[PDB]
Amino acid sequence: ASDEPIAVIGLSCRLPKASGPQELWQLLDDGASAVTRVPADRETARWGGFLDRVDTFDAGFFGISPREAAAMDPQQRLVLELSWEALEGAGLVPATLRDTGLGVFVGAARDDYATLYRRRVDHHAMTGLHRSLIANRISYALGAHGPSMVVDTGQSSSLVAVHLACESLRRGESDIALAGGVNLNIAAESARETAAFGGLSPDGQCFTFDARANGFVRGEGGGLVVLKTLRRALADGDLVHGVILASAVNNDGPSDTLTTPSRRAQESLLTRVYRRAGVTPTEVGYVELHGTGTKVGDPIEAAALGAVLGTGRDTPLPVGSIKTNIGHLEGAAGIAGLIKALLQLRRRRLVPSLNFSTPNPDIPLDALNLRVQQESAPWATTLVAGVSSFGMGGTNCHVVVSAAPALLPWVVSARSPQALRDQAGRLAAWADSPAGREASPVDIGWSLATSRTHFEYRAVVSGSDRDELVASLRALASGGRLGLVFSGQGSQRAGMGRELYVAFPVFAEAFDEVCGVLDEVMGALPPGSLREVMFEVSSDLLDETGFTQPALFAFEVALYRLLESWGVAGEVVAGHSVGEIAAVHVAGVLSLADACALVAARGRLMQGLPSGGAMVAVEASEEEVTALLAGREGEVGIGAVNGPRSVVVSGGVAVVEEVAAHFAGLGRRARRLKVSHAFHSPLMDPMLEDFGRVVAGLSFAVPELTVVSGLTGAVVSADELCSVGYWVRHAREAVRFADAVGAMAGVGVGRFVEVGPGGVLSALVRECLSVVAAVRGNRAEPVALLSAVGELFADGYPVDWTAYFAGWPAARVELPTYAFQRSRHWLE
Amino acid sequence: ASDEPIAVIGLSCRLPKASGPQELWQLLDDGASAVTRVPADRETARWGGFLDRVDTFDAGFFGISPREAAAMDPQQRLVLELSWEALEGAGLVPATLRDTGLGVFVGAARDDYATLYRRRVDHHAMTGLHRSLIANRISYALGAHGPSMVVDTGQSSSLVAVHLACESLRRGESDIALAGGVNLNIAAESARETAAFGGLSPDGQCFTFDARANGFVRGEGGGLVVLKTLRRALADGDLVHGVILASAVNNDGPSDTLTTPSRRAQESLLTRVYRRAGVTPTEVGYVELHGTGTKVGDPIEAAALGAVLGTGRDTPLPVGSIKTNIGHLEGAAGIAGLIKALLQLRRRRLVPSLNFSTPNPDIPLDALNLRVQQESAPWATTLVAGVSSFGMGGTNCHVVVSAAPALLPWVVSARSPQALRDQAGRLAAWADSPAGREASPVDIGWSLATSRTHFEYRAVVSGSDRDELVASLRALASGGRLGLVFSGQGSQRAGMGRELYVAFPVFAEAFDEVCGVLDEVMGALPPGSLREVMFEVSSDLLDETGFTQPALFAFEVALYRLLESWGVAGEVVAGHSVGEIAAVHVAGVLSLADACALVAARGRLMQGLPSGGAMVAVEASEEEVTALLAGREGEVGIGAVNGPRSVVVSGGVAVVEEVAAHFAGLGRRARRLKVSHAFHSPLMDPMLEDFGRVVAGLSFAVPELTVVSGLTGAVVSADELCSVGYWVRHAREAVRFADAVGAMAGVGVGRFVEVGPGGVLSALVRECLSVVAAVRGNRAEPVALLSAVGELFADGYPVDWTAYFAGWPAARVELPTYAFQRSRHWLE
Ligand SMILES: CC(=O)NCCNC(=O)C[N+](=O)[O-]
Ligand SMILES: CC(=O)NCCNC(=O)C[N+](=O)[O-]
After folding, report:
1. Distance between alpha carbon A607 and the CA centroid of its chain, in Å?
2. Which helix (H) or strand (E) holds A74?
3. What share of residues in chain B are helix, strand, coil (percent, to 5)?
4. DSSP 3-state assignment of B98?
5. What's the rounded Cα separation, in Å, for the pair B158 and B154?
6. CA distance linking residue B581 with residue B576, whole number of Å
7. How far from A474 is each of A427, B130, B342, B528, B819, CA to CA, in Å?
8. Other C-beta atoms lying within 10 Å of the C-beta of residue A348
9. Closest ligand 2 atom to Cα of B156
10. Residue nearest atom 11 of ligand 1, based on CA coordinates
11. Beta strand pairing call for B286-288 and B384-390
12. What are phi and psi of A752, to 5 degrees?
């Protein structure tokens, strides 16, 4: 190919009885006609291809006041809609194009709405009724700096728009291009002007190449293609819908009449454009005609396609015209023709040209070697199509297009709760439809995650099959710094991490690495496979602290690595007792080796202490409990200050039972905690000095995150944190968790996530103050985690959903476009 | 320069108080304002730059019916006019562009006339009111096959049109391009829409960069430039008016408001376009602003030209805006700005920007390093200018333009006697004006001859100085096969060819070559310098036939070579007696050597015969004279049958005097011819056999033209013509000249030219039947010849006037454009 072939990487279209590409396929393939009488709500030649309506537009979506919407050419309104839908169609997130060199090239040859406005004034009229802003408004809304223009060559405007975009891309003037056109028939005055010309079929049909040929029927609509160089297309890994090899535009020059087309000029345009692409009469699979159905214009266009592509061909050449389905869209005729050919090329199937029975007696189809496509068939032999579009003032354009070279989240967002509902439902319908079933649930979710604006109102639905997700959608249609708090002893439960292991490789890999180290450490000095202990439901081994502490650490670090791989990065971390070892390690203070040495030792040295230990949760203030225990320092102390009326008392089971009895006798809650020992009491004094010797052998680095101490109840710096005195004291004195939550909030934490099993810490964080428990109980682990990272994403946290789909080899696929909240806007 | 620089090789403009480029210079240089109140004949913000009128158009010139003219957007009408004037301005003859790849690119952003039509229907409305035909109609009229489009970027449309033409030329899509725009303010509805926007100065002035800045004043008009690649420009030897180095167009992207311009986007457009041309802040001589005079838009455009061209410059940069003279032409604003800069570049002088007194307090001119041009000065240092044009919808365009790297006929033609008159007068005014005086009479005539359509009504004026030609113009404002008949004995006069020798080198050269041979031939066997004999007025030597015959031959062959060098090529030739030797030689039958040998011999062998010879011209039929001379064959015969009542009797002076007496006695004309001998009588019998021996030594080739015999009275073929019998008989028997004219006419000759001195043969050709004598008497030879070739050109003969100007080194120079016969066309 001479010059850089251009990639159609997307498209949109509003056509008669075809609100999108899918519907346009249904219509064309069913061999259906959207030509009707003029709707009663239009003014009134009595025939035409009309949109279901031209008055409705989501002005708010594009930041347009109702009064500006009223004053705006519905052509401007529609092209905005089509622009957004073309980008979404291609997979590009429009915000990423802000300040890029995106070009806008639109064929517009009519200003009907300006006629309605003028035959009946505020600052709005100027921009609303001026044709230039059909392109310019697209450019202003996307914030694009590329060239932005409307072109008027009449009934060839929309294809010439495409040509100027291809050349624009070739010259590097623009990196991406929106091209096509728009034509709305919303004034009788233009209906009467084209009627008086003599161009209109009294029967209201384009009899394209048929012998009934007696004029064209009018149609209205718009189409846009998304254009990138083929090079840049493949590089950026974008859905390639088809490729423009060569575009050309000439003029009739010296025709018989101004309005008569010239056979010479059409041959000269064909010969040139094909030679630039290097395509012979035999390599062209199908030609999408102008084919207006005019007595004069049909034979000339036939004769010209004959001479160039009829000679040098054994088979007849298939020809058709979307003007037989939707009428003559004039300025938008060519982008209509191109968008058909592009669908015929992706589907690899031809569709019928309607209104053909007997051939025109001025068009020998046999001699010229062209056959009119009359049925939906498959397309034989890559596949190559040609598109013609001619203007009455003589300016012809042709384009040569070739075919292209366990638990899932679906994320949905909108600019409005009502849009989000509508967005959810539109995806359910599509997902559960034939066309959505050529796409896997995997592929869909990946496409939802990467290729779609995350608007201000967001939901996540989850499911294991399509039926489950579609069900969740239908149901849906009816911040600060991120703080992590790592769970302590009490939060453990048999099964811990089995369901997360089977589900997520990133958890399983990290869980295997942390268990591999721990199985060596514990295997050497046991209280030997920790995974088997944790994952077995028939086992109470985890209630024994020589297993509980390494188990909580293993589950918490796996979970942290899984969260981190989804972009859920804590900035500030705190831990309840053994929680702090997981927290401190992932803040990079201890290597995995030292962390495993530290936690396993702690587990063991405490495990080997005698019975006679107890802890009780008590509904009382710190000040109350200090008064009740003053003088008993040697037998009992405060194990935890968890809330302002939430402290755990720990020590001799004798004096604990007494304390539990006292607060119950005051009509307070008092729950006996299931634990082997009196943690954070004087009963820990025996193991302390042995614990101090294990930590004195470890290497403490400065943290990569802000650590808040469960001992200090405040932000803890490295010098304190990287000493032996801290970790012995940590093992012995009260967990100041309530105070830790305060210090986190004080330092700017707005979102709190419990990193551990259950929601013990989340409850205590709630009592102290946005709190979510990463893995709440009474539901499968994958469900409870996805739920939790869901709330975070909905509240505005930038979850990296892309990274959730590293496990699978998910491919981008076309999705429904934004469910516009259209409302009526019109003159009075 | 990155991409192929483009040559502006021509331009036209209709602007307020500036009907052409010359007037636009006068206005700009006088520092004049064409802003006025709305004329009373317009509908009605109360201020504007208006054309003297927008209703008048020569529809017939462009083959448009008055009814189609009525229905036509005056924008369409004006751009047709401007198209023809742009081509004529560049020197290109529009008929030569028929079927070439000429591109038409026009900025048009308004359809006012469609508003007038619709607020009040035939087949005419469709093409007349559709914007696309502003470009397409140009394309149809010129018969051009290049791309033909209107573009709408709003108030930047006309410069973007230029850009798309430059890129079109660079890609070889078009070989020549018409680019610019048009904007006519002929509807109140658009006046009220821009008023309500808030953009309009209540004072009705663009106070460009002045502190009174309070909006723009509207203006109307159009401009076109003629564009060719610089390569093709120099090659084809075309007037280069200036050269576009680099054109760029972008869009504001994310501006504060849709309609607010962005400083960022303007910097990005400037940086790019200049870098493509390779021009530094210091190489730019002047910048032609957008400079609307808006409070918001002036500072932003200033700030952006500052940042790019203000830094890196020791001197301030001169800036101005034609919007201070003619108002804001909107869609035609940019081509207005470009056409100024192009005139500043040819004149090598700056002009003032009006309405500047005190600088805007939001525009530090010192800091930004821009000074507003306030006076007409010279332009210091080749010269380089920049043109800005911005649209309200954000689409900016900039262009970088550099400065360029004895008796005369004036030919004038028109499509109408009234146009020819008007055409003649418009050239007289211009010729005799200062601007026409920078062009020599030579240069003018060459330009008239080569660079101007030869329309169906044509005149030639002649003169020796400008005063004489301008006088001839003012006076002017108050076919078949071409046959040559070569003069015989009787037509000679003393001076013969002296005035033609001094005048035309091609005659003089050929006269010297024919005399050089003859002076040898005659010098050897004399009856010795033939030029001296012929050119002397005090000499009767030429009445002696030994001189007369070579003299007629020498003058006739020189004249034939002069005629041939002007493209006045005879297809059929005849000669009276010695005439036939010149005729036969130039038909290539005899070489110059043999022709000179033949004629000189003939001259001599006849010269040496005795006295007693006479000839008399007689007003009588051949049949009458045969009856009167029957029986006297030995003493007298018919010397010539010249007309149907015109024969010359020749022989013994005794019997001739008798014949002269007889016809006088019958009351008939009878003129005694002044001759030495009785030519074509029995008195020639003595020299015949000696004549036969000279011709028998000569080489006769087949003629390259049709020869008609004065002996045969019919078309003579080579076998007869290339024999000795023919030329002896030719010398002896009657000249059947009347019959020769008949045979010429019979074989299709419609134009007859006497090749010889005087008009003896022309009279006889008139009597027999378009007849012109190449050199009639009683007037200087150059005058009488130019007159004669004038009549031929007027009657439709393709005279090659180009070839008349090989003598001088004449250069093409700009001329007045076609004097359109404008009449009113409008709606009712
Ligand atoms: C002379 C006449 O009525 N020609 C109509 C044929 N023109 C065409 O087919 C191009 N077009 O206006 O869509
Ligand atoms: C916001 C506003 O009224 N802006 C006017 C400034 N715009 C310009 O100068 C570009 N133009 O419409 O010729």
Report:
1. 50
2. helix A74-90
3. 45, 20, 40
4. coil
5. 9
6. 9
7. 9, 50, 67, 123, 77
8. 14
9. 13
10. A392
11. parallel
12. -115, 130
Nearest beta carbon to residue A119 from set B101, B119, B145: B119
Residues in chain A within 8 Å Cβ distance of B145: 250-253, 265, 268
DSSP 8-state secondary structure symbol assigned to residue B684: G
d(CA A361, CA A379): 28
* Six token digits for residue B660: 């002269």
Burial grade of B95 (CB within 10 A; 0-12, 13-18, 19 or more)? exposed
Residues A251 and B148 sit within 8 Å (Cβ to Cβ): yes
The phi, psi pair for B483, rounded to 5°, reads -100, 135
Q: Which residues line ligand 1 (CB under 6 A)?
A: A 155, 198-199, 257, 259-261, 292, 294, 296-297, 390, 392
Q: Do B136 and A395 touch (CB under 8 A)?
A: yes
Helices (H) and strands (E) in chain B, counts: 32, 28
Which residues does chain A have within 8 Å of residue B253's beta carbon, measured at their own beta carbons?
98-99, 139-140, 142-145
Closest CA to B124 of B114, B111, B110, B112: B114
Q: Which two tokens stand for residue B800?
A: 């090659």
- Residue written as tokens 């009767």? B540
Tokens representing B580? Answer: 């036939």
Nearest one of A27, A179, A45 to A104, comparing CA atoms: A179
CA distance to B519, B523, B524, B538, per residue, from B528 (Å)? 6, 6, 9, 17
Strand B377-378 and strand B349-350: pairing? antiparallel
Candidates B541, B552, B542; CA nearest to B585 is B552
Selection from B596, B549, B813 nearest residue B698 by Cα: B596
Q: Quick one: which H or E segment has residue A826?
A: none
Q: Provide the token pair at A697.
A: 């052998």
Q: Distance between CA atoms of B687 and B732, rounded to whole angstroms?
A: 10
* CA–CA separation, B476 and B61 (whole Å): 21
CATH fourth-level superfamily of A6-402: Thiolase/Chalcone synthase (3.40.47.10)
What HEC string does B272-335 produce? HHHHHHCCCCCCCCEEECCCCCCCCHHHHHHHHHHHHHHCCCCCCEEEECCHHHHCECHHHHHH
Enter the resolution in angstroms: 2.7
Which of B3, B8, B4 has its CA nearest to residue B228?
B8
Three-state DSSP class for residue A447: helix
Kindly state the helix (H) or strand (E) to which residue B411 belongs, with its residue range: strand B408-414
- At A70, is the secondary structure helix, strand, or coil? helix
Token digits of residue A410: 């679906």
The count of other CB atoms within 10 Å of the CB of residue A46 is: 11
Query: Which residue stretches of A108-187 are H helix?
Result: 112-119, 124-129, 133-142, 157-170
User: With contact defined as beta carbons under 8 Å apart, do A57 and A77 qualify?
Assistant: yes
Identify whether the C-beta of residue A432 lies closer than 8 Å to the C-beta of residue A424.
no
Task: Report DSSP state, residue B452.
Answer: S
Per residue, what are the HEC states of A622-683? HHHHHHHHCCCCCCEEEEEEEECCEEEEEEEHHHHHHHHHHHHHCCCCEEECCCCCCCCCHH
Say how many C-beta atoms besides its own lie within 10 A of residue B509's C-beta: 15
Residue type, A244: I
The four Cα atoms A289, A290, A296, A300 give a dihedral, to 10 degrees, of -50
Encoded amino acid at B210, one letter:
D
Token pair for A557: 């670090």
Question: Per-domain residue ranges for chain B?
Answer: 6-402, 483-804
The coordinates were experimentally obtained by: X-ray
Q: Are A311 and A281 in contact (CB under 8 A)?
A: yes
Label the pairing between strands B56-57 and B823-824.
Answer: antiparallel
CA distance A442 to chain B (A): 36
User: In CATH, what is the architecture of B483-804?
Assistant: 3-Layer(aba) Sandwich (3.40)
Nearest CA in chain B to A117: B189
CB A163 within 8 A of CB A399: yes
